Design a protein around this ligand. Structure first.
Ligand SMILES: *[C@@H]1O[C@H](CO)[C@@H](O)[C@H](O)[C@H]1NC(C)=O
Ligand SMILES: *[C@@H]1O[C@H](CO)[C@@H](O)[C@H](O)[C@H]1NC(C)=O
Ligand SMILES: *[C@@H]1O[C@H](CO)[C@@H](O)[C@H](O)[C@H]1NC(C)=O
Ligand SMILES: *[C@@H]1O[C@H](CO)[C@@H](O)[C@H](O)[C@H]1NC(C)=O
Lengths: 880, 880
């Protein structure tokens, strides 16, 4: 239950990074690329996996850190959509890792431990490619089944013997560094033999000279047998290169004392079949083609090739947090414990590339399989007790790392199958009584089987470096997006984190990807995308019922929850129309001209809600309401309205109209303003209370602080077919109106019906001077990008607007308003009679209930027979 | 006003496809790639631009076809977001097209018309690269300014002389095909001179022989001067290749009579500097390095290179619909008129590649600049009247095509600047009184300037083929997506259209892209994406006010409008919770345990609405309602509810509860079911009407056909902290219940509080036998993937459920129900006393108003002291 950072998340991490590649291909990377370009591989590979440990640390700090495995930390903190992608690529990469580790174990056993037994002997000098490949196919499968049966049965022992496998590593890594300081001031004896700039394989021949001093008869040596025709007299019919050159035996370990970095420095990339030349020896250019017993370039090499080969040496960081459920401070361990394991595995890798180039001669650094040093490991030469310490040691370490890599594949595939997120793999979840599978173990054995039929570590490693790069990409991608877009419930409370650092790791992992193999690279990213979306589809067929419509519902809810963070009043104002249509008996809209006019503002634009009310007794007329809404649905689509319908069968009219103002639009998507018709047959029989319901709407919108745009003379409104040409539009400004009265004429002219019309700004002045006040307007037109308007000032008497300045200070006398209604309308018609639309301000209604006539006869004079006029007013807005 | 298909959309299309490439590089494509691989370029280029004409035809048929230019057809029918991308790439490609056409005009004038005048003479034998390049920089700019001033001033003439430019084409294309049939049975005289497999430039030398028969003294010829040391005696110190070989003069036009396709067939790709060898001649391998007067490979060639060079020969299909506003049947023209122009331009291109290989010798087909045929155009040899007909003709045609290509760039950039969609380029919109710019013409002159500083047709053409491929990609991409995703207002009423055909064109245009130049390819697609999104951002800062929040609002509305197409009842059922909380004075929630329980079903899941009502007089207590909703907001987030709030200050309680059931959730996002508390202190003082408001909710949900889940004993509900372990959960089945009663226990166990609990299915049987009825259940558990439940049947008497079968047939006696309430509850407690939750069915309420007690004392007995029980009922659902 109680673990620590050291033995909890550091040692299982450091177990799963040091492995075969430090022993089996590292010096070959050192010798081929030189010091400098092999120095360039490791820093582009270590910093590829440092940045992922940072992005995983932000997953570590943020969240709850669920107990058990790293995958649940990856799944719960990024949504299950990425857990399908990152959880699956790390599966496939781990299955090859068990195959690559077991392939390295056969390679060292068949070369170094037992070179003698080989079931597929080379039948000729060039069968060595096929003979070695056909070894690795028929051998590792014989040891693959052994591995699977002991992870199926002896799973108790392998949990116990994990300390020895790390112990096999730790004694094997020191012995390099111990024997390294020994060769300084005391190099051991490992002679190599040379002939010309090229050299020769020293396997069978013991002593190298052109002759052989036998006690009384100096014979030509075995080299004469391996270069001339036969083993015979010292005579002709020999080579042209062996004759004109001489046999040289030099030291392959010149120690740290020599200057080697300055000479063994440059790139040595060669095509396949090239004989391993030394850059400093004497040679006679006689050009023999004599390839019997030599040393060659085994496969063709390049710089981009060695990156895809070296890269599985650094992998295994997701195994650093496999024991999260046993920790005590997991939000503090997983950043600290893992990155410090990265810093100690980069320190080893950068050291030995220097330490190999400064102590071992570069010609045997190109030598694969230790062929010039008589089947000794090139690392093992630098081992102070014995090479057998490393050879038996590095055999066990890649054995146990393969023993480790089978536990995870079987375990992980249950965790996705128990997650039930893909129904294709529901069958894999059937575990035993103790958490071991029989189907995931069948899948892991079958996928790792294909790597043995590849039968070469230098072709498995580029494929294996692909899948781990697919995970390390989508870890950095998902950490960057949720930090940039601010996906809800994502708070990375980590010190050393920034969003662009995962973005920089997102680019490098993509740069590593195409450079390896491009037609593998595209098919990797495309098969990743369609499995990603197939998660997102099957979220809908579980949660929102079924179908493809739920994905739009899910994306709707995922958007609507986002606006609940901030305030809706941050910067700007736009009208979002709630219109409401009165319905008589045999229910039809009383005035569709609003629904024309509403679309004559926000055509193909924002939130539009149509309002509607039916009176009395919801309990039976519901099917009528199902029928009445369809009338509007085929009426909104007729007049190009892309909006939403709301129909309520309330009891009383005053109740429904109050409700739809305060209860339309869920959540952050709210309507912003109300557009309403007019009680037209006003001074009539019974509708005086219905007139007061029109008054009752006004005091609602003041209390709800929502703008109101009520139309007058509604039948005389232009349809959506006809157009207008050359009619003026007037606003009538008061300083408390706001930028609606500026913005609303601008929104009108964008529609084609109100296109060819002129704008006459007829402002009402209450102050004295106009020139600064007209400058105040012309400043706004330079600000509001709508300088097409033309201004004109009027002012008569500030007592004639005592109906308005009484409200402005609040920002008989009611009879004193009614004389001033007539006097102001005389001004309006005399400058704007033939107006195709008028914009008038709607004043503040009285707080008194018997200010009903005191407000409305004042307004019916204020509509002194005008053609088209909107009475507007709004509250608390900003237009920038 | 009235145009036709022929002279309207066909001839302006056919004008803008035939151009320079048929005359200046086509034969060089024929000679280099052979017949077969040059045959492969044209079919991957013609079918690249056929499929775009189909996808443009679906834009042509669907929609209104606005008058004026192709861009408005592209913009209005795909949203303005793609019109930023497709409208801009077609601008940049057109600017280079004016530069590439004018560069070809200088090339033919400086080689073929006037070879004599050249301001930058070659100072040595290898200055020919730099001298020719420095010609094209200093010449075309002198003719660039001439082109700009006449499109600025003489724009009236160039509208008139467009018929002559097509007339320059049509007489020039026939003269190939006229002179082609002439060389069959009557080839003209165009001799070529050969020496070995290689050959020589025939510019200066007239007659070729190793000597020169002067009337009485046969001198060694000029070739002796161009191969040996000097012009001297017939002696030594000569070449080793000219001496051992001989001068051969053969025919370069062997006509259609010879078998040439069978011999001139294979690929002739050579590196730069290679001497043009004939594959069939006699040669002496003496290896001179004598490169004075020869013929060479001018630039290095490859198959992927010639595709990016040939491709601007097929471009110009967006100019096929530039005159849409003058048509009469534009929805029928633009499919028919354009594709038939594609069929007649593919017919020419495929013919001449055959006709060149079957009539002209392949060695002069590799010959650029007509150097072996004494500065004659290789096409012009096949011209029956004169080569000067083609040479003057193809000069004028690429002149007028360059004269055309300046009108569009200036015109198009206004149309985007008048669209105001990018504020960075608002300044470009300032036209003159007649639609000509001064800033777009400044931008078009400056962008085309850079191509002249490239000064080579074979480097401009790969860059020019990039931008036109960027448009032809995003045309096919946008046509495929809106057809697959079904974006609203997208109905392609075209015959010969399918969605995958634009998808196949989407792949090929992307295949053409990376193969040209990959590091140009990525930077093209990335600078396309961020300009695309920058349109989508600035839609929000104009429409939804401002900010980045409007993009989520816009994506919300774009999703909510989509569900208005189909029915919500297509396949499946899921609960979408509307919960409602009663609020007393000093307003707090009476029972938060619902809000625990609601999240104990849909945790991190779908639509959740909380319901709430305040009584009386909205006109002043609005700030309280602003305060009361914040109580719930910090209460829903406390109990892990990601849902939405609705608060109404209504008058009476019955009015508000009826309203929020029928008016919550805008549009397609509707709540599906109601969860409600219980009138707990039931038989008490005043709340009998408040009890009937609880009854009043029941008859609402029947009429609205929405499911109801009312909880009993609400204080005895487990919180979200505690857990449960080993308690049974019972449902109680009636055949008219529905799969809710099956699905609801399954939804409970997924939460961790209801995790470790058992499921006992206690069904109520009304029939006789149970074995088939239990088989009917076990069939459902095999169907519903939830076989963890365990069943048990009861049946006593069907008269004891006369309270239910009276309702089932509808799918004293009220007192006769009340005796049967006691008898059924005896069954419930005797098998399910220690139940941590009970699921009971809620029966149908009476239609009579005085069935108030007749329904509820029957139910209060039905909750005979049980711990936790939900009374559920729902109507008209499907669970699959
Ligand atoms: C090769 O080595 C021999 C020593 O046996 C020496 O005599 C001879 O000069 C050498 N040849 C060279 C250095 O070319
Ligand atoms: C060895 O010598 C040959 C000629 O003797 C030379 O051309 C070759 O480059 C040399 N090899 C090296 C320097 O690796
Ligand atoms: C080259 O041509 C001459 C004709 O002047 C002929 O005599 C000679 O044999 C030819 N050489 C060949 C075909 O190798
Ligand atoms: C011409 O002849 C040389 C040798 O005489 C030959 O190697 C070369 O391939 C020939 N050129 C061709 C066939 O194009």
């Amino acid at each position: 239950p109680q673990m620590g950072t050291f033995m909890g998340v550091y040692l299982p991490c450091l177990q799963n990074i040091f492995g075969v590649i430090l022993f089996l291909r590292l010096t070959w990377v050192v010798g081929t690329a030189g010091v400098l370009q092999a120095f360039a591989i490791v820093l582009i590979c270590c910093c590829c996996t440092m940045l992922t440990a940072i992005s995983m640390s932000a997953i570590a700090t943020n969240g709850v850190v669920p107990a058990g495995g790293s995958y649940f930390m990856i799944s719960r903190a990024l949504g299950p959509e990425f857990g399908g992608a990152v959880g699956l690529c790390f599966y496939l990469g781990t299955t090859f890792a068990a195959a690559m580790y077991i392939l390295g174990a056969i390679e060292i056993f068949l070369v170094y431990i037992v070179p003698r037994a080989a079931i597929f002997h080379s039948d000729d000098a060039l069968k060595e490619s096929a003979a070695m490949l056909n070894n690795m196919r028929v051998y590792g499968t014989a040891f693959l089944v052994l591995m699977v049966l002991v992870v199926f049965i002896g799973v108790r022992y392998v949990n116990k013997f994990a300390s020895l496998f790390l112990a096999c590593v730790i004694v094997s890594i020191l012995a390099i560094y111990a024997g390294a300081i020994k060769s300084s001031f005391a190099p051991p004896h490992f002679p190599v033999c040379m002939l010309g700039n090229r050299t020769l394989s020293s396997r069978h021949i013991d002593v190298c000279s052109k002759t052989k001093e036998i006690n009384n008869m100096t014979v030509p040596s075995k080299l004469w047998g391996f270069f001339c025709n036969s083993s015979q007299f010292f005579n002709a019919t020999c080579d042209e290169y062996f004759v004109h050159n001489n046999v040289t035996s030099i030291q392959g370990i010149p120690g740290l004392a020599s200057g080697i970095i300055t000479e063994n420095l440059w790139s040595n990339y060669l095509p396949k079949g090239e004989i391993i030349e030394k850059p400093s020896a004497k040679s006679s250019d006689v050009l023999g083609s004599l390839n019997h017993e030599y040393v060659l370039v085994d496969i063709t090499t390049s710089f981009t090739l060695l990156v895809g080969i070296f890269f599985p040496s650094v992998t295994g960081i997701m195994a650093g947090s496999n024991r999260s459920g046993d920790l005590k401070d997991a939000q503090k361990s997983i950043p600290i414990g893992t990155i410090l394991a990265i810093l100690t595995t980069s320190f080893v890798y950068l050291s030995n590339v220097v330490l190999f180039g400064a102590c071992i001669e570069g010609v045997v650094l190109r030598d694969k399989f230790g062929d010039a040093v008589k089947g000794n490991l090139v690392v093992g030469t630098l081992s102070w007790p014995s090479p057998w310490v490393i050879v038996i040691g590095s055999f066990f370490s890649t054995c146990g790392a393969g023993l480790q890599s089978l536990t995870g594949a079987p375990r992980l595939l249950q965790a996705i199958a128990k997650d039930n997120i893909i129904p294709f793999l529901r069958v894999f979840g059937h575990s035993k009584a103790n958490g071991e599978p029989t189907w995931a173990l069948l899948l892991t054995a079958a996928i790792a089987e294909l790597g043995i039929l590849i039968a070469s570590l230098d072709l498995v490693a580029p494929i294996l470096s692909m899948f781990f790069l697919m995970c390390y990409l989508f870890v950095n991608l998902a950490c960057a997006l949720q930090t940039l877009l601010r996906t809800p419930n994502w708070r990375p409370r980590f010190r050393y984190y920034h969003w662009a650092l995962s973005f920089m790791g997102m680019s490098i992992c993509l740069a590593l990807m195409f450079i390896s193999s491009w037609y593998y690279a595209i098919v990797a990213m495309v098969i990743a995308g369609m499995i990603y979306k197939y998660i997102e589809y099957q979220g809908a067929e579980k949660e929102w019922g079924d179908g493809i419509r739920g994905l739009s519902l899910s994306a709707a809810r995922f958007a609507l929850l986002r606006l609940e963070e901030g305030p809706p009043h941050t910067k700007n104002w736009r009208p979002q129309l709630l219109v409401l249509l009165k319905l008589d008996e045999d229910l039809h809209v009383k005035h569709p001209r609003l629904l024309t006019f509403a679309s004559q503002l926000k055509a193909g634009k924002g939130l539009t809600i149509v309002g509607s009310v039916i009176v009395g007794n919801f309990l039976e007329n519901y099917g009528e309401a199902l029928a009445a809404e369809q009338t509007i649905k085929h009426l909104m689509e007729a007049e190009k309205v892309k909006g939403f319908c709301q129909l309520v069968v309330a009891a009383k009219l005053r109740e429904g109209i109050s409700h739809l103002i305060q209860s339309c639009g869920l959540g952050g998507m709210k309507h912003n303003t109300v557009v309403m018709g007019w009680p037209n047959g006003w001074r009539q029989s019974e509708d005086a209370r219905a007139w007061k319901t029109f008054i009752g709407t006004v005091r609602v919108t003041t209390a709800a602080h929502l703008a109101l745009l009520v139309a007058k003379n509604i039948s005389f409104f232009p349809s959506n077919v006809e157009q207008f040409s050359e009619g003026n539009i007037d606003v009538w400004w008061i300083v408390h109106d706001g930028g609606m009265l500026m913005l609303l004429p601008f929104l009108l002219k964008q529609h084609k019906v109100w296109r060819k019309c002129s704008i006459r700004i007829f402002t009402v002045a209450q102050l004295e001077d106009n020139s600064i006040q007209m400058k105040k307007d012309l400043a706004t037109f330079l600000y509001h990008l709508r300088i097409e308007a033309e201004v004109e000032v009027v002012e008569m008497h500030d007592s004639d607007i005592s109906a308005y300045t009484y409200e402005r200070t609040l920002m008989q006398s009611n009879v004193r308003r009614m004389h001033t209604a007539v006097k102001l309308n005389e001004v309006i018609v005399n400058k704007s009679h033939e107006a195709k639309l008028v914009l008038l301000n709607m004043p503040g209604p009285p707080r008194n209930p018997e200010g009903d006539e005191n407000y409305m006869e004042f307004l019916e004079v204020l509509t002194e027979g005008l053609e088209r006029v909107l009475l507007v007013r709004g509250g608390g807005s900003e237009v920038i």
